[model samples]
Target: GRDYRTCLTIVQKLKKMVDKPTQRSVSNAATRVCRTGRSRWRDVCRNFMRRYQSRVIQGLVAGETAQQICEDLR
Candidate 1:
């Protein structure tokens, strides 16, 4: 829900690309798209992970554990 606008925008762009593309060389084009989208999501997730992880571990101590976090996530 937090990224609803971004998700919608991305899907709209994908829809436009699908609508404009021709049928020939279909498999090759789809494979290129698959790789590119995966890379894009990886970058986004990696950045989110870095920011979120910093927020989570900011004041952690040497002896403190992340058990509560694991339980909360579950």
Candidate 2:
């Protein structure tokens, strides 16, 4: 149940660590969430973190750099 600002911070950081497609996805999700009512922010942010956190960690362990694993998997 993180705040909107915290969710935005994570999104910004992840945008730098992920590939173009992932970044675009994140942006789209953020925009949709932002357009939704404030009461739903906590739920949406939690869902967002759950989705991207694993991908970011997977890339972290791979140790190649941002976008490499993404491309590998594509």
Candidate 3:
């Protein structure tokens, strides 16, 4: 049962770690659970963590493998 603040806090933190597109995707996806009737704290938390894990690939690849960056996420 996390609130909007909680969901938004995650997005704020993630902003430092990812690009606009990645951040937008993650934030939008997490916000969906928050806005949904079945939404729960765990749902958004899980989604936030998933996004962060994916963002790590960006940090690692840095731009060398930009084209195939998302491969690490899978």
Candidate 4:
């Protein structure tokens, strides 16, 4: 959806890696968004998690910082 910028913003707020805490944070964020009835927010959340999970992991493998990865995504 066109609210993809909001998705990006959410991504920007994520912690260093897709670890348990990070996933929990994302789930919490999605839960809040879903409560608003804007289901597309959940869609964006799931989409970004899938899309960025690998990228974030790879970035970490390559010794890149989370901030760098987030900026790169932007």
Between candidates 2 and 3, the one scoring higher on lDDT is: 2
Ranking by lDDT: 4, 2, 3, 1
* lDDT, residue 71, model 2: 41
Clashes per model (N, Cα, C within 3 A): 0, 0, 1, 0
- State the lDDT at 74 in candidate 3: 35
Residue 63 lDDT in model 2? Answer: 51
lDDT values for all models: 0.35, 0.48, 0.44, 0.49
lDDT of 2 by residue, 1-74 (tens): 34344444544455554455344554444444434446566566556556655554444444534445344333
Candidate 1 local distance difference test against the native? 0.35
Stretches > 4 Å off in candidate 1:
20-42, 45-74
Q: Write the per-residue lDDT of candidate 1 for residues 1-74, one digit (tens) a residue.
A: 33333333333333334443333332223333323456777565444334443322321212123433222333
Look at candidate 3 and tell me the lDDT of residue 42: 56
What does the lDDT read for residue 48 in candidate 1? 36
Please write out the lDDT profile of model 3 over residues 1-74, one tens digit for every residue: 33334434544444444454454554455444334334565576666455454453343334433323333433
lDDT of 4: 0.49
In the range 35-66, model 4's lDDT, one tens digit per residue, is 33367766766566665565544444454555
Query: What is the lDDT for 61 in model 3?
Result: 35
Residue 51 CA displacement from its true place in model 1, Å: 18
Q: By TM-score, is 3 or 4 better?
A: 4
